[PDB]
Assembly symmetry: C4
Homo-oligomer: 345 residues x 4
């Protein structure tokens, strides 16, 4: 019968597209970066640190919150260690704080402890958010804690946005495969290029009043611009934050150069089922505050180019063009022996 594999379309990631400049009466230092992570939760800047054991513990979540973003404490620890980490962030001046929850046996026990520590939002994320286990997990949590803010992921299709919204999620996280340390697309063959994924999911989210998060695959400040212009309410990153002194792990020096170890939570190292992540070393980047300053400067630039004083205006006025490989070469610095370090390239 007609039941058979189909090739549906071409899907794009951030490097495939550029934003067209609009006429503008706004300069970069006049724009506002506030966003609604959920209906109840507002962020001053639309950035989140990933809930990985190499990216976000309390030290990182504290620095994120004071920069106007938010950090999701990772769940690769005891329930009580994670509640202690959430309690350390909240005791640092009432800062926003998130906590990652997995679909497990102790899932409700973990939620209780991070709820007792007064976590502001829990992220129920799985390899595959469009599942029975996640859907039934969100219903279970919201039945107990109707006011607790719940982000569910990861997903990559508007049907999954709709299904996760019917389950009670207050926000939905987008990204199957784009992770810099992710091999899910290589080992299972599954994933959606992240620009198409975010655009289609945000469009459906907008129909329902449910925001979407662009999770994974972001390398430069410009990628973040594209993701918010595609419709994400916020951008979540591991690689971009994992080289920072505030992320867990010590700054190791090898051959006179400083490194931090960054790894996927599906890697063999994090899990000490077939691995879906790798483990490696990135260059130490310094303090989170200097990275955030370049990221925020890049976003304010992009909105100035597009004439958008708010993130809503950026979405409603974003037009992409697709570029080829040859346009990719043109869009990056070329035919130049770059010497001096650039703080955002």
């Amino acid at each position: 019968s007609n039941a058979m594999a189909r090739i549906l379309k071409t899907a794009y990631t951030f490097d495939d597209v550029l934003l067209v400049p609009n006429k503008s009466e706004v300069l970069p230092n006049e724009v506002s970066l506030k966003t609604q992570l959920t209906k109840k939760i507002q962020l001053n800047i639309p950035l989140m640190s990933a809930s990985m054991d190499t990216v976000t513990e309390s030290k990182m979540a504290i620095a994120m919150a004071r920069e106007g973003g938010i950090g999701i404490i990772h769940k690769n620890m005891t329930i009580e260690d994670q509640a202690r980490e959430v309690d350390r962030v909240k005791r640092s001046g009432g800062l926003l704080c998130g906590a990652s929850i997995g679909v497990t046996n102790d899932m409700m026990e973990r939620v209780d402890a991070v709820v007792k520590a007064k976590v502001d939002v829990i992220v129920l994320d799985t390899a595959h958010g469009h599942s029975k286990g996640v859907i039934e997990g969100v219903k279970r949590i919201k039945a107990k804690y109707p006011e607790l803010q719940v982000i569910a992921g990861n997903i990559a299709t508007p049907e999954a946005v709709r299904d996760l919204a019917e389950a009670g999620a207050d926000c939905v996280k987008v990204g199957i495969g784009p992770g810099s340390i992710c091999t899910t697309r290589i080992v299972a063959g599954v994933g959606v290029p992240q620009l198409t994924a975010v655009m289609d999911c945000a469009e459906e989210g907008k129909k329902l009043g449910i925001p979407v998060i662009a999770d994974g695959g972001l390398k430069y400040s410009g990628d973040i611009v594209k993701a918010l212009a595609a419709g994400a309410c916020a951008a979540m990153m591991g690689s971009i934050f994992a080289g920072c002194e505030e992320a867990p792990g010590a700054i190791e020096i090898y051959q006179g150069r400083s490194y931090k170890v960054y790894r996927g939570m599906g890697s063999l190292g994090a899990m000490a089922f077939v691995p879906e992540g790798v483990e490696g070393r990135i260059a130490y980047k310094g303090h989170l505050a200097d990275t955030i300053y370049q990221l925020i400067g890049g976003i304010k630039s992009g909105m100035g180019y597009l004439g958008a004083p708010t993130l809503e205006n950026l979405y409603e006025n974003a037009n992409f063009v697709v570029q080829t490989s040859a346009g990719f070469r043109e869009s990056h610095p070329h035919d130049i022996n770059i010497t001096k370090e650039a703080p955002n390239y």
Copy 2:
């Protein structure tokens, strides 16, 4: 006249596409990997070791069958030598076994011997399966041994699926050019990118009740998933298995590292054990025992079937939707902007 060359379409290979997640009720450890290699032969996993002199002999084929797959013992040996390798596998517990056959004038005598040795399926293996020799060779074999199971190949179009099924083949092997050791596309200009060829051939084979094998160019566990979602009943690999301890060939040490020889059957070297070569010779990293390699493959497939909500291989096919990515989406899919230090065992 209108008789002139044409550009028909764009054709895709595995790295061109990704599978879209589906709403899923089933977890990876719940799924069934069982498949029908032919109407009469079931495999416990849909994996097959290629019929090459650097991949499959009796040690490789025994290990494959023990893991739920099957090995096709190669023909680069005398007839009695190939019959004895088959019977070495069949005397190891009745394990399933295969043997490749060529379009030759000693063809029936080679078939005679492997069948007496209780082979389970022969593979009529030609550079060009959609040809008069293969079609007529399948008929002769089926007329002398109507029960014997015949895979025919290699081919790349639906018309070839149809002509080989009319000729009596129980299964057709798809793949012209994709092999890691293959220069057919470079020296003859001829091939079909493997994902489009599998999709097109599987669609015809399902109208006829004839399975198709995806042979060649598989590099990663996820590629197998795409080849199965595209409609193949099984995947056949050389490169993925050729480093394993149970492949023929001595371990070779170069500058303190371990490698095994891996070479195309159309390479100058394989042909000595006259036509221009259509393969290369080289060394491949030693991959340990076969078991370690199949484990990762199997886990990667199961992972893919959870992502698509598929408890059968059939269900995976009826619900598989592919999305095309660019070279930049390819760069996003693989790990990027990290200096990998520890070894990832399925990457």
Copy 3:
């Protein structure tokens, strides 16, 4: 509502396209390269040196004018210093000179000084040309100096051409993100591949009788040919001229080879003299401007010969592009040859 992000089309850069040869009655030595930079300023060759502190000061602007083109004195210096740079050009004969102007608190003060120093054209130069500040800046400058020739940039859309034209610009400069040293596309995600931007803008400009400049991203002479065939009246280059002796800066030697420093005006170092939108580095030292210009002019004249165009307007009216793939791109540059002699116009 319908208010959301859209993907409009695919846009192309110079390396995506090739010009198709036309039937031709003219050989390269017969074509004319004269161009109208504005309806008041004629250039003998359609080439400009960018307004960067590593490309154009008095010395480069003098050499460019003498070759038939023009230089734009940069503005990373005091007002009196830039006016003094302009006057030295104007005092070296009847020589054309340009000067760049920012949207600054002292904009009119800087315009007054270069006008008093007899500048021929000013370039109102910003990262984002389609902007209130540039539009009102053009209107003020043209209200005070109605005869002064004003170029306004940088922009990348027909709507920007039209709004700059109605604000009074005599010419608009096209290029958002294609510069060799630019990171605008990486840092802001914003840009338009330069071939599509030049074609779209030049078509709009031609309806108004306002010309456009192709600024940035030009690496080879053939790139300039495609920029002019797409409708630009002139081509602006930083990288191509920044290795020349006439550019500012000393020659540097590293590991036995000659270089010059080259850096974007939005780089950290340029602004030392807001997050950066350019990088800083070194390019090969190319020798004197005269030999580089000879190569560029020769390549342009050869392009017009292939296209049967004795004038630049004829080039535009007869230009036809095909899109090439990645594989075509490798066909177009020398391939499968270990190049051993330096050619004056390649690598």
Copy 4:
């Protein structure tokens, strides 16, 4: 007006495409490679060596003729020397011989000399063949020698095929910018990807009974199959033949590896014997012509087996191309193999 630049289409080169296998009744040892270079000149194999001073003088033309092809003696030498080169080939047993002619003030004198030496075919060779000079030159030549076989080029559009045919060309040479040593597309921005060029032009040639030659950009035997399947009567190669002992220039050796010099006729080096339109470098020494021809022919015969073509006309009338991505390209070459043994037809 509507007179403006246009983007006509996407155009393909050989690596963009693969040929689809056809049902075949013919094996590679059963096909025939005979071809008509013009109405009067038959070739036993469809191969020509390029008219360059690193590829073809009398030594190369003698060896090509003996192999069944033809060599085009270059014109970067005096009129008398080129006649004697042609004469040396004709007195080696009446072997087939061509000679190159340019659009020069002495072109009829050059034609006179090589005709007296009994050349079989003239190549009016010029950077841009779709030009008054070449149209008028072919008219002058055919008026004085109505029976002299005349090839003219180089061109890249069906319009050019028509215009040269009306002028009396017996065969047309297709290729603008695809040569291994060509920089025309880089310095002038002008060219057409070679597969599209040959397909369009051959189709136009077939309406006229005028054949086309695929000149340039061929790297493997498989590329020749695509060029003939696209409708070229013959393939012309520089790079593939410049490494042989029979090409002019000595066999050098550096660090144990032997090599020859190879350069464009538009390179600085060749012209000292307008800005350059080629590069100069070195390629691997390949040995004697006979060993290279054998591989090329085996590859072509293999391709025709795959496509079921007993003849080149059959190949053309049954050729169906599929377009492949960048990722299809990597699947098509060998991949993930450390090649240890050099193959006669792949490196």
